[PDB]
């Protein structure tokens, strides 16, 4: 609770460290190329 109201350490929960930030290997792929487990196909566009 109330003790610092900011904390000395940031206490980062998660910031998609595993992902390559943006896997632009997906970007450019057609629907067939775009693997769903790999990349999210949305709006006729393959994107990580």
Swiss-Prot record:
Give compartment(s).
Cell membrane
Q: Where is the lipid attached (GPI-anchor amidated aspartate)?
A: 48
Q: List the range of the whole protein covered here.
A: 445 to 491 of 514
Q: Where is the composition biased (Basic and acidic residues)?
A: 22-33
The entry's protein name is: Variant surface glycoprotein ILTAT 1.24
Function summary: VSG forms a coat on the surface of the parasite. The trypanosome evades the immune response of the host by expressing a series of antigenically distinct VSGs from an estimated 1000 VSG genes.
Q: Which domain of life is it from?
A: Eukaryota
Q: Where is the composition biased (Low complexity)?
A: 12-21
Q: Where is this region: Disordered?
A: 8-33
